Amino acid sequence: LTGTGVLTESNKKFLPFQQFGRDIADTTDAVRDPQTLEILDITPCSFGGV
Amino acid sequence: QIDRLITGRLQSLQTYVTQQLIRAAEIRASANLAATKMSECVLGQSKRVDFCGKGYHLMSFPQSAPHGVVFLHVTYVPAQEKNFTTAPAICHDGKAHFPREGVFVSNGTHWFVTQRNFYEPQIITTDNTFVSGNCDVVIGIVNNTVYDP
Amino acid sequence: SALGKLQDVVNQNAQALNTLVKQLSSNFGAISSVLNDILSRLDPPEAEVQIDRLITGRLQSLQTYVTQQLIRAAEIRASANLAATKMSECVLGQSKRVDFCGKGYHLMSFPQSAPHGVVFLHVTYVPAQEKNFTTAPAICHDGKAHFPREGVFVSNGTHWFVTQRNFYEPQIITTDNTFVSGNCDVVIGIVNNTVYDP
Amino acid sequence: YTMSLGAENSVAYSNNSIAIPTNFTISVTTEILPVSMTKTSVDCTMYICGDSTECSNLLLQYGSFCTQLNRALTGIAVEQDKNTQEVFAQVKQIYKTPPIKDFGGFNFSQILPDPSKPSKRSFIEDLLFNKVTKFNGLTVLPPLLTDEMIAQYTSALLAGTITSGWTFGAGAALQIPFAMQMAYRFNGIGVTQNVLYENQKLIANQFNSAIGKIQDSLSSTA
Amino acid sequence: TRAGCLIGAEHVNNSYECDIPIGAGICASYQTSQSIIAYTMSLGAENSVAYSNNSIAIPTNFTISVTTEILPVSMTKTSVDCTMYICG
Ligand SMILES: *[C@@H]1O[C@H](CO)[C@@H](O[C@@H]2O[C@H](CO)[C@@H](O)[C@H](O)[C@H]2NC(C)=O)[C@H](O)[C@H]1NC(C)=O
Ligand SMILES: *[C@@H]1O[C@H](CO)[C@@H](O[C@@H]2O[C@H](CO)[C@@H](O)[C@H](O)[C@H]2NC(C)=O)[C@H](O)[C@H]1NC(C)=O
Ligand SMILES: *[C@@H]1O[C@H](CO)[C@@H](O[C@@H]2O[C@H](CO)[C@@H](O)[C@H](O)[C@H]2NC(C)=O)[C@H](O)[C@H]1NC(C)=O
Ligand SMILES: *[C@@H]1O[C@H](CO)[C@@H](O[C@@H]2O[C@H](CO)[C@@H](O)[C@H](O)[C@H]2NC(C)=O)[C@H](O)[C@H]1NC(C)=O
Ligand SMILES: *[C@@H]1O[C@H](CO)[C@@H](O[C@@H]2O[C@H](CO)[C@@H](O)[C@H](O)[C@H]2NC(C)=O)[C@H](O)[C@H]1NC(C)=O
Ligand SMILES: *[C@@H]1O[C@H](CO)[C@@H](O)[C@H](O)[C@H]1NC(C)=O
Ligand SMILES: *[C@@H]1O[C@H](CO)[C@@H](O)[C@H](O)[C@H]1NC(C)=O
Ligand SMILES: *[C@@H]1O[C@H](CO)[C@@H](O)[C@H](O)[C@H]1NC(C)=O
Ligand SMILES: *[C@@H]1O[C@H](CO)[C@@H](O)[C@H](O)[C@H]1NC(C)=O
Ligand SMILES: *[C@@H]1O[C@H](CO)[C@@H](O)[C@H](O)[C@H]1NC(C)=O
Ligand SMILES: *[C@@H]1O[C@H](CO)[C@@H](O)[C@H](O)[C@H]1NC(C)=O
Ligand SMILES: *[C@@H]1O[C@H](CO)[C@@H](O)[C@H](O)[C@H]1NC(C)=O
Ligand SMILES: *[C@@H]1O[C@H](CO)[C@@H](O)[C@H](O)[C@H]1NC(C)=O
């Protein structure tokens, strides 16, 4: 998978075989780093109207 | 491929925007109704039937709510009803007497005049009733004596 | 800015049309936004595809504009029904509906035309100068209680009058301003006084 | 089944028989109305073409779709703000109830603001608030009037109604004992005022019972 | 503010009628030497009604006020030639 966002230390407990998270509205939410066995939350980068 | 995707996403956005516009028109109608209710119901006393709760309206109290309003309608409802004999007028001395504000009633023996929305009998006097015509016209006139104070 | 409500409407319509016109300047994926150029530059085999793209785009723009017009026409129909109801129950009569025909107590209304709209001059009555008074719901005279027919009892400190409730018009308390009911052991707040009998 | 419209009830009509009520009830009903939506706003460029220059270049061919969509959503948000403003902001001033609650026996403590409360909301207001329950170009603009301000507006309207009747709407607020205001209202419904004063305690108790029943209904049924 | 970051606006404590709405109870406006200020909009001057169980306030004078209520009635009867617009 590919995307843009900020990776942060997560609070979830992924199963040993789960890789990619998913929110309710079919949006990627967290990922499992392939090398380090740590789960990273993907918070999309800040934006807003001017 | 990106032309296809852009067309699809634009169509989805247009559908969403049209649905939002229609639902917002609905909500604007609801908000106009709520404003009218607050103006005529809270700030005053409505005489429009079933516009401010079943029964005769007394008052209202507004209450906030998330993206909405809640009216507490305080209304007056007659509960306990009695059967009385009635007449459209009573004949005293050839004249026909009609109630100024109320209706004639009879518990079988005597004739009284009561306000229409609450049984409060009062002896019939020339200050409760007004004269008109004679007793040969009104269909159903009854006989009685109009006490003179 | 007073007539903004009207101006807005006009502006909106104009804006819509403008966008529609500007939608003629878009290629929508075609090789040119001018139909004549595509017809002059390509043979039918691919001119048909290009014109198909242009037609799809312009048809979508037209449908969008039509839907916008329909929704705005529903808005304006609602406003027109409101205006008709106001004219019926406000000009051709006297509405007792609170705040529906101007702030205060409604006296009358006068309609005025305006470009794509109407303007109501609502003539209303508003109390201005007010005075405090001590008041009582009823008064004993001979054990019986008297209640005011129209108006409320007031006291300027020493004497008691009966005055209509929308304009201080003190009148002596008598048996033609007040009506009797029962006795004055039940009403809460009663005060003593004499009820002059004509 | 074939649904029944209602219970059959023949009226004993007769040309010389009338039915007059001898007693009444003071019933409080509840009427719920929506006033506004959530002020949603969508950024078409980021939704359609999230972080993609080529997609944006292709999208720029379609003209001014985004301008009119954003304009419509902005109009929607403005309209919601206007709806809330016109529904609630109908009192020129902010009246507040005096500490004395000598309201002819009527008890408004369930609708007046609670000085010890989360956001100065009344009991029924708090019940209503408690009975009702991202970064992809979609945002939710905040309403112009915060719930505290709407609570203040309802408090001003309620205090005006309680302490002045209807006069506070027409013009300057004119105080009046609540019993006399209810006498006005009874005169307004064709029931002479003496009915009130002779049955003041009963009417006050009935109103309190009705408010309690409304409380229970709101607390029980979501 | 709860609506975001505002730059160029002088934050004052005094409340005023809302002129340019920002959000979350904050409105901005140009005021006096002159500059742009953002403030928590006021709902109106507060007041207390001297309510007591045996006190009534009655008017003695009056004013006849003519207010103005504006209502749109009709749009511009636009008509579009579909075939000429699409396929001129
Ligand atoms: C109809 O009502 C009248 C008025 O109350 C009744 O007449 C009175 O009856 C009581 C008995 O309860 C006597 O004490 C009064 O002296 C009577 N007053 C008069 C003026 O007669 C009458 O009895 C009632 N009739 C029926 C059938 O209920
Ligand atoms: C309250 O009103 C009464 C009635 O007008 C006032 O009594 C009158 O006062 C005038 C003097 O201003 C005398 O000439 C009358 O003879 C009085 N009439 C009666 C029946 O007493 C009374 O003074 C007023 N009280 C106040 C405090 O203004
Ligand atoms: C109005 O005047 C009457 C007098 O006619 C008062 O009635 C008296 O009440 C006292 C109790 O406070 C009794 O001790 C007397 O016996 C009563 N007198 C009579 C003749 O019944 C009445 O209290 C007065 N009202 C007010 C509100 O003071
Ligand atoms: C009118 O109705 C009310 C309530 O239905 C009556 O008040 C009740 O009176 C009875 C006496 O028989 C008491 O036991 C109840 O506790 C009362 N209820 C309340 C809520 O106070 C009232 O008596 C009726 N009045 C008439 C004239 O019928
Ligand atoms: C108005 O009614 C409320 C309840 O409906 C009263 O508050 C109650 O007061 C009693 C006595 O202290 C407490 O035991 C209850 O827990 C209270 N209930 C609530 C919901 O607060 C209130 O006292 C009444 N107002 C007046 C002036 O009597
Ligand atoms: C992958 O290799 C790194 C060092 O190159 C090591 O620290 C890490 O533990 C390895 N991960 C696994 C799952 O073997
Ligand atoms: C009045 O009389 C009719 C029949 O004459 C009867 O059905 C009705 O119940 C009576 N009304 C009351 C309140 O009892
Ligand atoms: C009412 O109906 C009865 C029943 O026949 C009749 O005798 C009487 O004359 C009628 N009265 C009126 C006023 O219609
Ligand atoms: C009423 O009394 C008159 C005599 O004064 C009589 O002629 C008439 O028949 C009476 N009507 C009724 C309904 O009793
Ligand atoms: C009535 O008395 C109160 C005292 O609490 C005062 O504030 C108010 O101004 C008085 N009314 C008028 C019209 O002056
Ligand atoms: C009105 O309130 C006062 C206290 O300010 C009290 O003394 C008086 O008894 C009350 N009157 C009534 C009728 O409740
Ligand atoms: C506004 O008041 C607060 C205290 O309530 C104070 O800290 C702040 O400095 C004040 N700001 C201005 C511009 O007066
Ligand atoms: C009522 O107000 C007007 C001002 O338009 C004033 O001229 C007039 O004297 C006032 N009337 C009374 C009785 O104060």
For tokens 């029962």, name the residue.
C182
Whole-Å CA distances, A50 to A47, D112, E4, E6: 9, 40, 10, 10
Taking the C-alpha atoms of residue B132 and residue B143, their distance in angstroms, rounded to an integer, is 15
Please state, in angstroms and rounded to a whole number, the distance separating the CA atoms of residues B84 and B88: 13
Q: How many CB atoms lie within 10 A of CB C156?
A: 13
Task: Write a three-state SS string for chain B.
Answer: CHHHHHHHHHHHHHHHHHHHHHHHHHHHHHHHHHHHHHHHHHCCCCCCCCCCCCCEEEEEEEEEECCEEEEEEEEEEECCEEEEEEECCEECCCCEEEECCCEEEECCCCEEEECCCCCCCEECECCCEEECCCCCCCCCCEECCCECC
What is each CA distance from C173 to B125, C135, C138, D2, D218, in whole angstroms? Answer: 22, 13, 11, 65, 48
* D24-34 and C105-114 beta bridge pairing: unpaired
Render E16-35 in DSSP notation, one character per residue.
---SEEEETTEEEEEE---E
**Residue of minimum CA distance from atom 4 in ligand 13:** E63
Antiparallel, parallel or unpaired: β C117-127 and E62-72: antiparallel
User: Which residues in chain A are contacts of D135 at CB distance < 8 A?
Assistant: 43-45, 47
**Resolution limit, Å:** 3.4
Helix (H), strand (E) at residue C178: strand C178-180
Spatial distance between the Cα atoms of A33 and B38, rounded to a whole number of angstroms = 58
d(CA B32, CA B29): 5
* Torsion sign, CA atoms C7, C13, C16, C17: negative
DSSP H or E stretch at residue C112:
strand C105-114
Torsion angles phi and psi, residue B81, rounded to 5: -115, 145
Does the distance separating the beta carbons of B10 and D48 come in below 8 Å?
yes
Q: Which two tokens stand for residue B7?
A: 């067309």
Question: Is the alpha carbon torsion for D117, D121, D122, D123 positive or negative?
Answer: negative
Query: One-letter amino acid identity for C129?
Result: Q
Distance, CA of B39 to CA of B59 (rounded, Å): 12
Burial group, residue C142, by CB count within 10 angstroms (0-12, 13-18, 19+)? exposed
The rounded distance, in Å, linking the Cα atoms of E56 and D163 is 10
Q: Report CA Rg, chain C.
A: 35
**C-beta of residue D178 within 8 angstroms of C-beta of residue D159:** no
Atom 22, ligand 5: which residue's CA is nearest? Answer: D109
* Tokens, residue C1: 């800015």
- Chains contacting C (3 or more CB pairs within 8 Å): B, D, E
Pick the closest to residue E71 from C12, C70, C120, C108 (CA basis): C120
User: For strand C105-114 and strand B96-99, is the pairing parallel, antiparallel, or unpaired?
Assistant: unpaired
Q: How was this structure determined?
A: cryo-EM
The dihedral formed by the CA atoms of D55, D60, D62 and D66, expressed in degrees to the nearest 10: 100
Q: Which of helix, strand or coil describes residue D141?
A: strand
* Coil, strand or helix at A30: strand
Residues contacting D135, CB < 8 A, separation 6+:
A43, A44, A45, A47
- Mind giving me the DSSP string for A31-47? EE-SSS--EEEEEPPP-
* Separation CA D161–CA D152 (nearest Å): 14
Q: Is C11 on the interface with D (CB under 8 A)?
A: no
How many CB atoms within 10 Å of residue B139? 7
| C-alpha dihedral (D108, D109, D114, D120), degrees to nearest 10 | -30
Report d(CA C110, CA C124) in Å as an integer: 11
Count the helices and strands in chain A (H runs, E runs). 0, 3
CA D73 to chain centre: 26
D31: enclosing H helix or E strand: strand D24-34
Q: Is the CB of C25 less than 8 angstroms away from the CB of D63?
A: yes
Q: Do chains B and A touch (3 or more CB pairs under 8 A)?
A: no
Gyration radius from chain E CA atoms: 25
Residue C172 dihedral angles phi and psi, to the nearest 5°: -60, 145
Go through chain E and list every residue after which a break occurs, taking a C to next N gap over 2.5 angstroms, comma-separated: 32
- Burial track A18-38 (b if 16+ CB lie within 10 A, e otherwise): eeebeeeeeeeebbbeeeeee
Instruction: Nearest by CB to C130, from E57, E72, E87: name it.
Output: E57
Q: In the 8-state DSSP scheme, what is residue D60?
A: G
Nearest to C180 by CA among D197, B146, B97: D197
Q: List Cβ neighbours of E8 (8 Å cut-off, separation of 6 or more).
A: E36
Specify the DSSP element, H or E, that contains D127.
helix D123-130
What φ, ψ does residue B99 adopt, rounded to 5°? Answer: -75, 135
Structure tokens at C46: 């691919």
Exposure on the CB side of residue E38, measured as CA atoms within 13 A:
17
Rounded-to-integer distance, Cα D185 and Cα D192, Å: 10
> How far is C114 from C111, CA to CA, in rounded Å?
10
- Using DSSP bridges, classify how beta strands B68-78 and B56-65 pair: parallel, antiparallel or unpaired: antiparallel
Residues D5, D191 contacting (CB under 8 angstroms): no
List the single residue in A43, A44, A48 with the smallest CB-CB distance to D139. A48
Q: For A25, which DSSP code?
A: T
Length of chain B: 149
